[PDB]
Amino acid sequence: TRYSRLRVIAEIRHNIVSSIEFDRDDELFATAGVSRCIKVFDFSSVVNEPQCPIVEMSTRSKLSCLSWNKHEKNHIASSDYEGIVTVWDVTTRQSLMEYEEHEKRAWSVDFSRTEPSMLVSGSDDCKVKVWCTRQEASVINIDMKANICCVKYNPGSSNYIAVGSADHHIHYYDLRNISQPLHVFSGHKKAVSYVKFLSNNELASASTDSTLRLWDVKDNLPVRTFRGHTNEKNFVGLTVNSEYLACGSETNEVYVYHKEITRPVTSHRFGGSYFISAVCWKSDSPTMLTANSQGTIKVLVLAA
């Protein structure tokens, strides 16, 4: 009841944007995708102005994902279609680390919130790699049996990662003993394209079966399935906060779900054949960043 619409409060008119992410203070955000350019914008400027990035970093390969460091304000990691995982400093524009062990496209990178020098990546090479920014070689390698589409650290401990796999399952690992996952969550009928935590115990996933799912990683239980959007092919984005899930759709629409309700609380038509390609909440607030396959960026806000 609280919200029925998404209001557009800003738009940057444009190339697919595969990732849009806020820095540790929700002050800057970065975008990246097929154009081989990591662009950094000032959020307040975008909201207030009638819009140029403050930093642009050219890359050798198409980008699949970004993750800002949670301690070092100025550091951001990228994964690319060559398999390289790069840590960048947005003030100097330099690559700080270039991790080159993946043999195929890396789809995901995630910096840990609680051990901020640690970052994890997953790849079409079927490996999960854990890296430490002070070391050139990977610290942990998990050999899996299928392409890895997303890896995410638990927000409360760097010992746990969720792995979304093309085998249709979420593999939840304790990195202190990688012999077997703690649990493998089955329920999706197609590849699991995203995993994101609402809290220490609540995990959400997206899949090309046109569903989102909510899972309890304390008691290893399925919770809820969310339906309404169309997602049979593309990476269309998933972002969650403590209460809400948002995802893209192949209908060029953003969908929002409350975690307790299986059908959308609202949706927004972006304004064919376009798809939403990236979404990111501004922490626990009703404000979110969104981008689509044309490269348009919008700042949206849930509203009554």
Partner 1 sequence: RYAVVP
Is residue 136 within 8 A of residue 116, CB to CB? The reply is no
Answer yes or no whether residue 78 interacts with partner 1 by CB under 8 A.
no
Measured from the CB atom, the residue of 113 and 169 that comes closer to partner 1 is: 169
Measured from the CB atom, the residue of 218 and 233 that comes closer to partner 1 is: 233
Answer yes or no whether residue 83 interacts with partner 1 by CB under 8 A.
no
Measured from the CB atom, the residue of 32 and 256 that comes closer to partner 1 is: 32
Give me 45's structure tokens: 């400027």
Answer yes or no whether residue 235 interacts with partner 1 by CB under 8 A.
yes
Contact segment (CB under 8 A) with partner 1 among 22-30, 188-196, 217-225, 282-290 equals 188-196
Answer yes or no whether residue 210 interacts with partner 1 by CB under 8 A.
no
Helix H or strand E encompassing 48: helix 43-48
Answer yes or no whether residue 234 interacts with partner 1 by CB under 8 A.
yes
Distance of closest approach, residue 294 Cβ to partner 1, in angstroms: 12
Answer yes or no whether residue 33 interacts with partner 1 by CB under 8 A.
yes
Spatial CB neighbours of 180, under 8 Å, sequence gap ≥ 6: none
Single residue of 32, 166, 170, 217 touching partner 1 by CB under 8 A: 166
Query: Dihedral through CA 54, CA 58, CA 109, CA 232, nearest 10?
Result: 100
Single residue of 193, 241, 249, 251 touching partner 1 by CB under 8 A: 193
Single residue of 257, 293, 296, 297 touching partner 1 by CB under 8 A: 293
Give me 291's structure tokens: 């981008």
Rounded to whole angstroms, how far apart are CA atoms 285 and 228?
Answer: 23
Rounded to whole angstroms, how far apart are CA atoms 233 and 210?
Answer: 9
Distance of closest approach, residue 284 Cβ to partner 1, in angstroms: 28
Spatial CB neighbours of 49, under 8 Å, sequence gap ≥ 6: none
Answer yes or no whether residue 18 interacts with partner 1 by CB under 8 A.
yes
Measured from the CB atom, the residue of 111 and 275 that comes closer to partner 1 is: 275
Answer yes or no whether residue 62 interacts with partner 1 by CB under 8 A.
yes
Q: Kindly provide the b/e burial profile for residues 14-51, where b requires at least 16 CB atoms within 10 angstroms of the residue's own CB.
A: ebbbbbbbbbbeeebbbbbbbbbebbbbbbeebeeeee
Distance of closest approach, residue 147 Cβ to partner 1, in angstroms: 4
Distance of closest approach, residue 207 Cβ to partner 1, in angstroms: 8
| Displacement of CA 228 from its chain's centroid (Å) | 20
Rounded to whole angstroms, how far apart are CA atoms 88 and 83?
Answer: 16
Binding site for partner 1 (CB under 8 A): 16, 18, 33-34, 62, 124, 147, 149, 166, 190-191, 193, 208, 233-235, 275, 277, 293
